Design a protein around this ligand. Structure first.
Ligand SMILES: CCCCCCCCCCCCCCCCCC(=O)OC[C@H](CO[C@@H]1O[C@H](CO[C@H]2O[C@H](CO)[C@H](O)[C@H](O)[C@H]2O)[C@H](O)[C@H](O)[C@H]1O)OC(=O)CCCCCCCCCCCCCCCCC
Ligand code: CLA
Ligand code: CLA
Ligand code: CLA
Ligand code: CLA
Ligand SMILES: CC(C)=CCC/C(C)=C/CC/C(C)=C/CC/C(C)=C/CC/C(C)=C/CC/C(C)=C/CC/C(C)=C/CC/C(C)=C/CC/C(C)=C/CC1=CC(=O)C(C)=C(C)C1=O
Ligand SMILES: CC(C)=CCC/C(C)=C/CC/C(C)=C/CC/C(C)=C/CC/C(C)=C/CC/C(C)=C/CC/C(C)=C/CC/C(C)=C/CC/C(C)=C/CC1=CC(=O)C(C)=C(C)C1=O
Ligand SMILES: CCCCCCCCCCCCCCCC(=O)OC[C@H](COP(=O)(O)OC[C@@H](O)CO)OC(=O)CCCCCCCCCCCCCCC
Ligand SMILES: CCCCCCCCCCCCCCCC(=O)OC[C@H](COP(=O)(O)OC[C@@H](O)CO)OC(=O)CCCCCCCCCCCCCCC
Ligand SMILES: CC1=C(/C=C/C(C)=C/C=C/C(C)=C/C=C/C=C(C)/C=C/C=C(C)/C=C/C2=C(C)CCCC2(C)C)C(C)(C)CCC1
Ligand SMILES: CC1=C(/C=C/C(C)=C/C=C/C(C)=C/C=C/C=C(C)/C=C/C=C(C)/C=C/C2=C(C)CCCC2(C)C)C(C)(C)CCC1
Ligand code: OEX
Ligand SMILES: [Ca+2]
Ligand SMILES: [Cl-]
Ligand SMILES: [Cl-]
Ligand SMILES: [Fe+2]
Ligand SMILES: [Mg+2]
Lengths: 39, 40, 34, 30, 38, 334, 341, 29, 81, 65, 32, 37, 34, 37, 30
C-alpha cells in the first residue's frame, strides 16, 4: 500500500527532479544561445 | 528616459538613499517604544 | 587528593614521545653535511 | 606528584623560551 | 615592614628618576634620521 | 662621554638583543616582580578570603588545585579599593589570607604592560619606523585595564577584578553575565565581531597569500624555502590572489592595494577589541546590556516570552547562586 | 561542440558574479537559507515549539528575533514540507518549526557549494586551494554544532536557534549544563580565535608601520602599485623590531602567512571535536579529585567548585521555561539560592 | 509629531541645499 | 572590467530612477499592506496579540506529538473560542 | 626489476595502465546508477528518520519480537 | 527582454528586501 | 642489494623544533589536569 | 596485587630514556655523509 | 662568533645501538620486579 | 599493569633479536 508518507516521499522526489530538471534545461538553453567566441 | 550615466549626481543619490536608511531605521527604533515589543 | 593514578605516566609519555621524535629529527638534520 | 608534574611542564616551557630567543637560528639576509 | 616600605620607595624612586631624566636626555635626537629637533 | 651619557647610550641602544629603552627601565623590574610573585603564589599561596566573609578560596597548586582550577585569588572585599601593599599588613600570613599577592601582581603587571606599549613606540622611533604598532597593542592592554582595574573601581572592590586563573576567569565571566547581561550589550557584540572577524580575516589572508606563492621549489621540499629573508621581490602573485578573491565574491569586494588590505587587518580586530574593552569599562558603571524582559505582551496583558526572557532565566540562576554566603539584603547593588 | 562543454563554457564565463558548476548548488541553497532566516525572523512565531515570540511581527527586535528549533516531540525529523508532520501545509510547517530544518539543511548544502566554489575558482585562476582548505573550519563548526550536536541529543529542539539572543541562550545553556568553559577542546578553540585575532592585528599593524616611503603623500596608501615587484614594507626592519621587543620574530614571510591560516583554522577544528563530545553529554564537567576532597572537607573551596554552584543555579532557574516539553514544576522551596538573593 | 518631522526635513535639507546650490553656480567648493 | 555597465553609471541615470521611483515605493507599500491587512498572520500562522491564549488559560500550546502535530495545533487554534 | 613466478602470473592484471575508453564512454549509465543510489539512500534515511512510514515496517526495537 | 546574471542576483535580494522593509515599517504601528 | 631511488633525506630546522616543543609542552600543560582528574 | 604504584612509570622511563638516547645517536650517525 | 675548533662529530654504529638497547631492555626486565615490589 | 609491563619489555627484546639478526650492519671484508 501507498502510505501517506510514501506519497509524501514521491512528491518530494518529483519536486526535486523538477527543480533540477528546470534548472539544467534553462542553463543548457542559455549556454546554447550565449556562446563564447573562439576559432 | 536615457540610459545615460551620470545624469543625476552620485552625491545626491548617496545623500537621499542615506537619509532614507536613517528614516527607516529611525522608524524601527520608534517601534521599540510603541505597540508590540514596547513592554507596555 | 584522589587523582587518577595513570595521570603521571600519561602526562610523562605525552611530553616525552613527541618531544623525542622532534629531537631525533633536529639533531640528525644538524649532523647532515653542510 | 600532580603538582610536581604541572610545575615541571611549566619549567620546561620557560627553558624553551630561553633557548628559542637566545639560541634561535639567526635570521640571515642572503 | 617599615624597612620593606622604605626599600620599595627608594627602588621605585630610583627607576622613576631613570625614566624621567632618561627621556629628558635629548630623546628626540635618538632616531636614525633628522636629529636636530630642538 | 661621562657615565650618564654612556648609560643613556646603552639604554637606548638599537644593538641590544632585547631593546631596553626608558619605558624598559620601568617595564623590566615591574614585570619581573609581577611574574615572580605570580609564579610563587600560583604554586604555593594559601587560601584567600576573596569575598571578605572569612570563607577562604584555595587558588594554589600545593593547596589542591590543578592548572585549570588554580588561580591567584583577588584581594578581600573587606579591603575594597584600599591599597594593600605588604607593608600595610601585620605579617605575611595576614597579607596572604587577605589576597595581597593579587594587588602586587596586577599593579606591577598593568604598569609593566603600559610600559611595554610605550617601548613599542620607543623602538619604532629608534629604528626609523612608523609609530603605530603600539596603538594596535592598546586594544588588548585596554582590555586588561578593564578587567583588573576599571571594573574594580566602578564596583568598589578589587575582589571583583578578574582572578588570575583559568577557572577564575570563567567565574568572572558568568557573574558578569548575571549582573550586566553582557551578551546583550552592543560593545561586547562588536568585540565578538572583532575577534570572529579577526580570526576569519587571519585565515583568509593566510590562505590567499599561501594560494598564490610563486613556484621556487620542487615537490620534495617545503615551499617555505622559496622565500629568502630580506629578498627584494614579493614572494606571491598579488594579481593572482586578487583575481581569485574578486571572482569568489565579486571584483570590488577584493582588495588590490596591499596597504589598504593590511590596514584593514589591523583596524578590524583592534577597533572591535577597543569596543570590547569599553563594554567592560562602561558596564563597570552599570550601564548594562539591553533588557527586553517582558517586552512582548499579548492583548490581555499576558507576557509572551522571547529568547531574551530565556536568557533572563539563565541569568537569574547565576545571580541567585553566586557568592552564596555574601549577600544579606535583597538587591545586589555592587 | 556537445551540450556539456557548451554549458561548461557559459557557467565559467568571466562575469560580475561568477557562477560555475558550483553555483548550481550554492546559489539556490545560500539564497533559501538567508531568505528562510529573514522570512522567519520577520513573520514566524515560536509559540507552538517553544512558547516564545520570535518575529518582528510579534514585537521582537533585531536582538531577540530568531528562527527557532522545532518542538522536542519532533525528535530529529527532517520536517520536510511534504512530510508526515506538516503534510504539505505551509502554515502548519512554519508553526511546527519546519523553517529550522529548512535553513539548517539548505545552509549545510550552501556551505558545501561555497567551498566547491573556492575550489572551482582556484582551479580556473590557477592558484593553490588553501582558501577552500581554510574553509573546512567553518564547515566543521557548522556541522558539529547545528547537526551532530542535536543528533546526539533528544531532538533538534536543543540545536542552536537562528537568532542573536537565541544564540546567547545556547552559550549559557552550555555553561550551566555542559560546563563547556572547562573543556580543553573549547579552550584550544578560544586560543585559536583570540590568537588569530592577535595575528590579524599584529601583522596588519606591523606592515603598516614598516612601510617604505614610496611617495610624497602623508597618506601612504597611494604609494602602492598592484603590479610592483618590490615588498611594500621592510621584513628586515620588522624582524629587528619584534626580535628586540618580544624576543622572537618572523623571518620567513611564507611561514608567517601559513601560520595565519594554521592558528584560527586549528582552533575552530578543536572546538568542533569538543562539541561532538557534548552531543553525547561527554563533558569535561568535573575534576573527580576536587569533588572527593570537597565532599569530605566543607572548608575546601576553589574557583572550580564556585562555578559549579553557578551552573546548578543556571539549570534549576532556566530549565522549566527553557525545556517546556518536560513540564518541570520546581516549588519555590527547592530552588537553589544563596542568602538573601 | 508632524511639526517635529517637518522641522527635521527642513533643517536636514539645508546642508545638502548649500552644497547643491554652490555646485550649480560653480562655487568655491 | 566584467562587461556590464558600472553600478555608479546606472544609479545616477534618469532611466534608473524613473523605473525605481515606481517599483521601490510599490514593493514597500505591498509589504506594508501584507502586514496592515493582517495577511502576514494568516500565511505564517503567527498569533495576533489576542491569539496567544484563550481568556483564562496560562499554559502554552506546546506540540507534544510528532505525527499528530498538525492536528494538535489545529486543536489549540479551535480552543481560542 | 625482479621477475617471480607469482609476478609472471599476475602480470596481465597490471598491464593496461592509462588505457581509456574514448570520450564520455559509459558516463551516462554511471549517472543513472548514481541517481538511483541517491534515491536509495534517501529512502533508507527517511525510513530510519520516520519521515517515510511503510506498512509492516515498525522502525522500533519492537520491530519483530 | 535581455537579462544578466548580475541583474538577477541583485533583484533576488533587493526585491524581497524592500517588501520586507515595508512589512516591518507597518509593524511599528501594531498595538496589542 | 640495488639501492632504492625513492629515498629522501628528512629535515627539522631549529625553529620547528622550538615550535614543536612549545606545542607539546603547552598541550601537556593543558591536558595534564584532565589526565589526573 | 598491591604493587608499588610508581613501578610502571619507573620501568617505562628506565627503558625509554636511554633507548631514546641511543636511537637519537644512531639516526644522526646514519644521516652523516657517506 | 668565530667557530670552536674543539668540536668533534659523535657516532653510534648500528651494532652499538643493538647492544645498547639489549643492555637497557634486559636491565629493565631484571629491575622492573623490584621497582613494582 | 605489572604483567603488561613485563610482557611489553619481553616483546621488545624479541623484536630486538629480529632486527639484530636480519637487519644487522653486514660484516664486510675490506
Ligand atoms: C562533514 C561532511 C559535510 C556534509 C554535510 C552536509 C550533510 C547534510 C545531510 C545530512 C542529514 C542527515 C540527517 C540525519 C537525521 C537522523 O539521523 O535522525 C535520527 C534517526 C533516528 O531517529 C531517532 O530515534 C530515536 C531512538 O528511537 C528508537 O528507540 C526508541 C526508544 O526505545 C523507540 O524504540 C523508537 O521507536 C526507536 O526508533 C528517537 O526516537 C528520536 O526521537 C528519533 O529522532 O536516525 C536516522 O534517521 C538515520 C540514522 C543512521 C544514519 C546517521 C548518519 C548521519 C548522522 C551522523 C551523526 C550521528 C550523530 C550521533 C551523535 C554523535
Ligand atoms: C540544488 C538546489 C537545491 C538543493 C540541493 C535543495 C535541497 C533540499 N531541499 Mg530545497 N529548493 C530549491 C533548491 C534546492 N533544494 C529551490 C530552487 C526551491 C524553490 C522551489 C526549493 C524549495 C524547497 C522546499 C519548500 C523544501 C525544500 C527541501 C529540501 C531538502 C529535501 C529535498 C528532497 O527531499 O528532494 C527529493 C528529490 C530529489 C533529491 C531529486 C532526486 C532526482 C533523482 C536524481 C531522479 C532519479 C532519476 C534516475 C537516475 C532515473 C533512473 C531510471 C531507471 C528507473 C531506468 C533538501 C535539503 C525541504 C526541506 O528543506 O524541509 C525542511 C522542503 O520542505 N526545498
Ligand atoms: C621600576 C621599578 C618599580 C616600580 C615603578 C614599582 C611599583 C610599585 N611597587 Mg614594586 N618593586 C620593585 C620595582 C618597582 N615597583 C623591585 C625591584 C622590588 C624588589 C625590591 C619591588 C618590590 C615591591 C613590593 C614588596 C611591593 C611593591 C609595591 C609597588 C607599588 C607601590 C609602590 C609605592 O608605593 O611607591 C611610592 C613611591 C613614591 C610616592 C616616591 C616616588 C617619588 C617620585 C619622584 C614622585 C613622582 C611619581 C609620580 C606618581 C609621577 C610619575 C612620573 C610620571 C609623570 C612619568 C607599585 C605598583 C607594593 C604593592 O605592589 O602594593 C600592592 C608592594 O607591596 N614593590
Ligand atoms: C562564542 C562566544 C563568545 C565569544 C567569541 C566571546 C568573545 C569575547 N569575549 Mg565574551 N562571553 C561569552 C561568550 C563569548 N565571548 C559568554 C557566554 C559570557 C558569559 C558567560 C561572556 C562574558 C564575557 C566577559 C565578562 C568578557 C568577555 C570578553 C570577551 C573578549 C575576550 C578576548 C579579549 O578580551 O581580548 C582582549 C585581550 C586581552 C584581554 C589580552 C591582554 C593581554 C595582555 C596585555 C598581555 C598578557 C601577557 C601574558 C601575561 C603573557 C604572555 C606570554 C608570555 C610568554 C609573553 C572577546 C571579545 C572580555 C572582554 O570584553 O574584555 C574587554 C570580558 O571581560 N566575555
Ligand atoms: C574569550 C571568549 C570566547 C571566545 C574567543 C570563544 C570562541 C569560540 N567559541 Mg566559546 N563561549 C565562551 C567564550 C568564548 N568562546 C563562554 C564563556 C561560553 C559559555 C560556556 C562559550 C560557549 C560556546 C558555545 C556553546 C559554542 C562556542 C563556540 C566557539 C567557537 C565559535 C567559532 C565560530 O566562529 O562559530 C561561528 C559559526 C561558524 C564559523 C559556522 C559557519 C558560519 C557561516 C560561514 C556563516 C555564513 C553567513 C552568511 C554568509 C551571512 C549571514 C546573514 C546575516 C544577515 C546574519 C570559538 C572557538 C562554538 C563551538 O565550539 O563550535 C564548535 C559553540 O557551539 N562557545
Ligand atoms: C535550482 C536553481 C534555480 C539553480 C540556478 C543556479 C544559477 C545558475 C543561479 C544564477 C542566478 C543567481 C546569480 C542567483 C543569485 C542568488 C543569490 C543572490 C544568492 C545569495 C547568496 C548569498 C547568501 C551570498 C552572501 C553574500 C556574501 C558572499 C557576502 C560576503 C561579502 C563579505 C562580507 C566580504 C568580506 C568583506 C571584505 C571587504 C573582505 C576583505 C577582507 C579580506 C578577507 C581580505 C583578504 C585578502 C583579500 C584580497 O583581495 C587579497 C589580494 C589578499 C592577498 C587577501 O589576503
Ligand atoms: C606556576 C605555574 C604552573 C604557572 C602557570 C599557570 C598558568 C595559568 C599557565 C597557563 C597555561 C596555558 C598556556 C594555557 C593555554 C593552553 C591552551 C588553550 C593552549 C592552546 C593549544 C592549541 C594547540 C590550540 C589550538 C589553536 C592554536 C594552534 C593556537 C596557537 C596560538 C598562537 C601561538 C598564536 C600566536 C601568538 C603570538 C604572540 C604570536 C606572535 C607572532 C609574532 C612574533 C608577530 C610579530 C611580527 C609580525 C609581522 O607582521 C612581521 C612582518 C614580523 C617580521 C613579525 O615578527
Ligand atoms: C579618523 C577615524 C578615527 C579613528 C578610529 C580608529 C580606526 C583607525 C585606527 C586603528 C588602529 C590600528 C593600529 C594602527 C594601524 C596603522 O598603522 O594605520 C596606518 C594607516 C595609514 O597611515 P598613513 O600615515 O597613511 O595615514 C595616517 C596619517 O599619517 C594621515 O595621513 O592609518 C590610517 O589609515 C588612519 C585612517 C583614519 C581614517 C578612518 C579609519 C577608519 C575607522 C573609522 C571608525 C569607524 C568604526 C566605528 C563603527 C563601529
Ligand atoms: C621584554 C621581553 C619579553 C620576553 C618574554 C618572553 C617571550 C617568549 C616568547 C615565546 C618564545 C618561544 C617561541 C618558541 C618557537 C619559536 O622559537 O619561534 C620562532 C619562529 C621564527 O619564525 P621564522 O619565520 O624565523 O621561521 C620560519 C621557518 O624557520 C619555519 O621552517 O617564530 C614564529 O614562528 C612566530 C609565531 C610563533 C609564536 C609563538 C608565541 C608563543 C607565546 C607564548 C605561549 C606559551 C605560553 C605558555 C605559558 C605557560
Ligand atoms: C553623502 C554620503 C552618505 C550620506 C550622508 C548623509 C545621508 C547625510 C546627511 C546629511 C544631512 C541631512 C545634513 C545636514 C545638515 C544640516 C544642518 C547642519 C543644519 C543646521 C541647522 C542649524 C544650525 C539651525 C539652527 C536653528 C536654531 C538653533 C534655532 C531655531 C532656528 C534654526 C532652525 C535656524 C553616505 C554615508 C551614504 C555614503 C557616502 C556619502
Ligand atoms: C523561506 C521559503 C522560501 C523563500 C524565501 C525567500 C527567498 C525569501 C526572502 C527574503 C528576503 C531576501 C528578505 C529580505 C530582507 C531584508 C531586510 C529586512 C532587511 C533589512 C535591513 C536593514 C534594516 C538594514 C540595516 C542596517 C544594517 C544591516 C547595518 C548598517 C546600517 C543599517 C542600520 C543600514 C520559499 C518560497 C522557497 C519556500 C518555503 C520557505
Ligand atoms: O563580590 Mn564578586 O559578585 Ca559584584 O555583585 Mn555584589 O559584589 Mn559580589 O555579588 Mn554580585
Ligand atoms: Ca488592545
Ligand atoms: Cl561565585
Ligand atoms: Cl548584602
Ligand atoms: Fe600579509
Ligand atoms: Mg512596536
Amino acid at each position: 500500500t501507498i502510505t501517506p508518507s510514501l506519497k509524501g516521499f514521491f512528491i518530494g522526489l518529483l519536486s526535486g527532479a523538477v527543480v533540477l530538471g528546470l534548472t539544467f534545461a534553462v542553463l543548457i538553453a542559455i549556454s546554447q544561445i550565449d556562446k563564447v567566441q573562439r576559432s | 528616459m536615457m540610459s545615460e550615466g551620470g545624469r543625476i549626481p552620485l552625491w545626491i543619490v548617496a545623500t537621499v538613499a542615506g537619509m532614507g536608511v536613517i528614516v527607516i531605521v529611525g522608524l524601527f527604533f520608534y517601534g521599540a517604544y510603541a505597540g508590540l515589543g514596547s513592554s507596555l | 587528593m584522589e587523582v587518577n593514578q595513570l595521570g603521571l605516566i600519561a602526562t610523562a609519555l605525552f611530553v616525552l614521545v613527541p618531544s623525542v621524535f622532534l629531537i631525533i629529527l633536529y639533531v640528525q638534520t644538524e649532523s647532515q653535511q653542510k | 606528584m600532580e603538582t610536581i608534574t604541572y610545575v615541571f611542564i611549566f619549567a620546561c616551557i620557560i627553558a624553551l623560551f630561553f633557548f628559542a630567543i637566545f639560541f634561535r637560528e639567526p635570521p640571515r639576509i642572503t | 615592614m617599615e624597612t620593606l616600605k622604605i626599600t620599595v620607595y627608594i627602588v621605585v624612586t630610583f627607576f622613576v628618576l631613570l625614566f624621567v631624566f632618561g627621556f629628558l636626555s635629548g630623546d628626540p635626537a635618538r632616531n636614525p634620521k633628522r636629529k636636530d629637533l630642538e | 662621554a661621562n657615565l650618564w651619557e654612556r648609560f643613556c647610550n646603552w639604554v637606548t641602544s638599537t644593538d641590544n638583543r632585547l631593546y631596553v629603552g626608558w619605558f624598559g627601565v620601568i617595564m623590566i623590574p615591574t614585570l619581573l616582580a609581577a611574574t615572580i610573585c605570580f609564579v610563587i603564589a600560583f604554586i604555593a599561596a594559601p587560601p584567600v578570603d576573596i569575598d571578605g566573609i572569612r570563607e577562604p578560596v584555595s587558588g594554589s597548586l600545593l593547596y589542591g588545585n590543578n592548572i585549570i582550577t588554580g588561580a591567584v585569588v583577588p584581594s578581600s572585599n573587606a579591603i575594597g579599593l584600599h591599597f594593600y601593599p605588604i607593608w600595610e599588613a601585620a605579617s605575611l600570613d595576614e597579607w596572604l589570607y587577605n589576597g595581597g599577592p593579587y594587588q602586587l601582581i596586577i599593579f606591577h603587571f598593568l604598569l609593566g604592560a603600559s610600559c611595554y606599549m610605550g617601548r613599542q613606540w620607543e623602538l619604532s622611533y629608534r629604528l626609523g619606523m612608523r609609530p603605530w604598532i603600539c596603538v594596535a597593542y592598546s586594544a588588548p592592554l585596554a582590555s586588561a585595564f578593564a578587567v583588573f582595574l576599571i571594573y574594580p573601581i566602578g564596583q568598589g572592590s578589587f575582589s571583583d577584578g578578574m582572578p588570575l586563573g583559568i577557572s577564575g576567569t570563567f567565574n568572572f565571566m558568568i557573574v558578569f553575565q548575571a549582573e550586566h547581561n553582557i551578551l546583550m550589550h552592543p560593545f561586547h557584540q562588536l568585540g565578538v565581531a572583532g575577534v570572529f572577524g579577526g580570526a576569519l580575516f587571519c585565515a583568509m589572508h593566510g590562505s590567499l597569500v599561501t594560494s598564490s606563492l610563486i613556484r621556487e621549489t620542487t615537490e620534495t621540499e617545503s615551499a617555505n624555502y622559496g622565500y629568502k629573508f630580506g629578498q627584494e621581490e614579493e614572494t606571491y602573485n598579488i594579481v593572482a590572489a586578487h583575481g581569485y578573491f574578486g571572482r569568489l565574491i565579486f571584483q570590488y569586494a577584493s582588495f588590490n592595494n596591499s596597504r589598504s588590505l593590511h590596514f584593514f587587518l589591523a583596524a578590524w580586530p583592534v577597533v572591535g577589541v577597543w569596543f570590547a574593552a569599553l563594554g567592560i569599562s562602561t558596564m563597570a558603571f552599570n550601564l548594562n546590556g539591553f533588557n527586553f524582559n517582558h517586552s512582548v505582551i499579548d492583548a490581555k496583558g499576558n507576557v509572551i516570552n522571547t529568547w531574551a526572557d530565556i536568557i533572563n532565566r539563565a541569568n537569574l540562576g547565576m545571580e541567585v547562586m553566586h557568592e552564596r554566603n555574601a549577600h544579606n539584603f535583597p538587591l545586589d547593588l555592587a | 561542440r556537445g551540450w556539456f562543454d557548451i554549458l561548461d563554457d557559459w557557467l565559467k564565463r568571466d562575469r560580475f558574479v561568477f557562477v560555475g558548476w558550483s553555483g548550481i548548488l550554492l546559489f539556490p541553497c545560500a539564497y533559501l537559507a538567508l531568505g528562510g532566516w529573514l522570512t522567519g525572523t520577520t513573520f514566524v512565531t515560536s509559540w507552538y515549539t517553544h512558547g516564545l515570540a520570535s518575529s518582528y511581527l510579534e514585537g521582537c527586535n533585531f536582538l531577540t528575533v530568531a528562527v527557532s528549533t522545532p518542538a522536542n516531540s519532533m525528535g530529529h525529523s527532517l520536517l520536510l514540507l511534504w512530510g508526515p508532520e506538516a503534510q504539505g501545509d505551509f502554515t502548519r510547517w512554519c508553526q511546527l518549526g519546519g523553517l529550522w530544518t529548512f535553513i539548517a539543511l539548505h545552509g549545510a548544502f550552501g556551505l558545501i557549494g561555497f567551498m566547491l566554489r573556492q575550489f572551482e575558482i582556484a582551479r580556473l585562476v590557477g592558484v593553490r586551494p588553501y582558501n577552500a582548505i581554510a574553509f573546512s573550519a567553518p564547515i566543521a563548526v557548522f556541522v558539529s554544532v547545528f547537526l551532530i550536536y542535536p543528533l546526539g541529543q533528544s531532538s533538534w529542539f536543543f540545536a542552536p536557534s537562528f537568532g542573536v539572543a537565541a544564540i546567547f541562550r545556547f552559550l549559557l545553556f552550555f555553561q550551566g549544563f555542559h560546563n563547556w568553559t572547562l573543556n580543553p577542546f573549547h579552550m584550544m578553540g578560544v586560543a585559536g580565535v583570540l590568537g588569530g585575532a592577535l595575528l590579524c592585528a599584529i601583522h596588519g599593524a606591523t606592515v603598516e608601520n614598516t612601510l617604505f616611503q614610496d611617495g610624497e603623500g602623508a597618506s601612504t596608501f597611494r604609494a602602492f602599485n598592484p603590479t610592483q615587484a618590490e615588498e611594500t614594507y621592510s621584513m628586515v626592519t620588522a624582524n629587528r623590531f619584534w626580535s628586540q621587543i618580544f624576543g622572537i620574530a618572523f623571518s620567513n614571510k611564507r611561514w608567517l602567512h601559513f601560520f595565519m591560516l594554521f592558528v584560527p583554522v586549528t582552533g575552530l577544528w578543536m572546538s568542533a571535536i569538543g562539541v561532538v563530545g557534548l552531543a553525547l553529554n561527554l563533558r569535561s564537567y568535573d575534576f573527580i579529585s576536587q569533588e572527593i576532597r570537597a565532599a569530605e572537607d566543607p572548608e575546601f573551596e576553589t574557583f572550580y567548585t564556585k562555578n559549579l554552584l553557578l551552573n546548578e543555579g543556571i539549570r534549576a532557574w532556566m530549565a522549566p521555561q527553557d525545556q517546556p516539553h518536560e513540564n518541570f514544576v520546581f516549588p519555590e522551596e527547592v530552588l537553589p539560592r544563596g542568602n538573601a538573593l | 509629531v508632524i511639526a517635529q518631522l517637518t522641522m527635521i526635513a527642513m533643517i536636514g535639507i539645508a546642508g545638502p541645499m548649500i552644497i547643491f546650490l554652490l555646485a550649480v553656480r560653480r562655487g568655491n567648493l | 572590467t566584467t562587461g556590464e555597465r558600472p553600478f555608479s553609471d546606472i544609479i545616477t541615470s534618469v532611466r534608473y530612477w524613473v523605473i525605481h521611483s515606481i517599483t521601490i515605493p510599490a514593493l514597500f507599500i505591498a509589504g506594508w499592506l501584507f502586514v496592515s491587512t493582517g495577511l502576514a498572520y494568516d500565511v505564517f500562522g503567527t498569533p495576533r496579540p489576542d491569539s496567544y491564549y484563550a481568556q483564562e488559560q496560562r499554559s502554552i500550546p506546546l506540540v507534544t506529538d510528532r505525527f499528530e502535530a498538525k492536528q494538535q495545533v489545529e486543536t489549540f487554534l479551535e480552543q481560542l473560542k | 626489476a625482479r621477475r617471480t613466478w607469482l609476478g609472471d602470473i599476475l602480470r596481465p592484471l597490471n598491464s593496461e595502465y592509462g588505457k581509456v575508453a574514448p570520450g564520455w564512454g559509459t558516463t551516462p549509465l554511471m549517472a543513472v546508477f548514481m541517481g538511483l543510489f541517491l534515491v536509495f539512500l534517501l529512502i533508507i534515511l527517511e525510513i530510519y528518520n520516520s519521515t517515510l512510514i511503510l506498512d509492516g515496517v515498525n522502525v522500533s526495537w519492537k520491530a519483530l519480537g | 527582454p535581455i537579462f544578466t546574471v548580475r541583474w538577477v542576483a541583485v533583484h533576488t535580494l533587493a526585491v524581497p528586501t524592500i517588501f520586507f522593509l515595508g512589512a516591518i515599517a507597518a509593524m511599528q504601528f501594531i498595538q496589542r | 642489494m640495488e639501492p632504492n631511488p625513492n629515498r629522501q633525506p628528512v629535515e627539522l630546522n631549529r625553529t620547528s623544533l622550538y615550535l614543536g616543543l612549545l606545542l607539546i609542552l603547552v598541550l601537556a600543560l593543558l591536558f595534564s589536569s584532565y589526565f589526573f582528574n
